[PDB]
C-alpha cells in the first residue's frame, strides 16, 4: 500500500541526503511557486503509523491545519516537505523518527522511534 510504496519509491528531499524524509508527488499543484519561510500555510493531512493505525486526520475535523512555515512549529519532516510543495499539490511523505518525534514519541498516539506516513494537501499559503 501507499506507505510501502513511498518507502521503496520515494525521493529523498533532505539536505543531508540521509533518506530521513522521502516524498512522492500524488497530485501536481499549480504553477511553480512554493511557500517561503514564515508564510501561513494551510494543509489537510492524514497520518498513519508503521503498524497501520491512522493516528490523525484534519479532514475528519472539517478544518485545515495552519502553521507558520520553517519556524519549528511542527515536526521537521513537515517543515521540510511542505516547503517543497506547490499550492494545490498532494504528496506522500515517509518520515524517519529523527525528522519526527524521535525516541520521545508523542502521547498518546505516537510511540518512541516511530516512522510516520502522511498524505498532505497544500491548500494555500500567504505571507
Amino acid at each position: 500500500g501507499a506507505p510501502a510504496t513511498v518507502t521503496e519509491q520515494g525521493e529523498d528531499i533532505t539536505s543531508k541526503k540521509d533518506r530521513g524524509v522521502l516524498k512522492i508527488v500524488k497530485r501536481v499543484g499549480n504553477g511553480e511557486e512554493t511557500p517561503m519561510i514564515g508564510d501561513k500555510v494551510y494543509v489537510h493531512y492524514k497520518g498513519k503509523l508503521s503498524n497501520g493505525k491512522k493516528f490523525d486526520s484534519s479532514h475528519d475535523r472539517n478544518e485545515p491545519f495552519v502553521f507558520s512555515l520553517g519556524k519549528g512549529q511542527v515536526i521537521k519532516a513537515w517543515d521540510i516537505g511542505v516547503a517543497t510543495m506547490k499550492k494545490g499539490e498532494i504528496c506522500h511523505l515517509l518520515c524517519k523518527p529523527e525528522y519526527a518525534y524521535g525516541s520521545a514519541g508523542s502521547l498518546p498516539k505516537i510511540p518512541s522511534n516511530a516512522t510516520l506516513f502522511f498524505e498532505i494537501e497544500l491548500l494555500d499559503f500567504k505571507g
Binding site: 497520518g47 491545519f65 502553521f67 511542527v74 518525534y101
Partner: peptide, 5 residues
C-alpha cells in the same frame, strides 16, 4: 500535542 512540536 501532535501535530505540534
Amino acid at each position: 500535542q501532535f501535530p505540534f512540536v
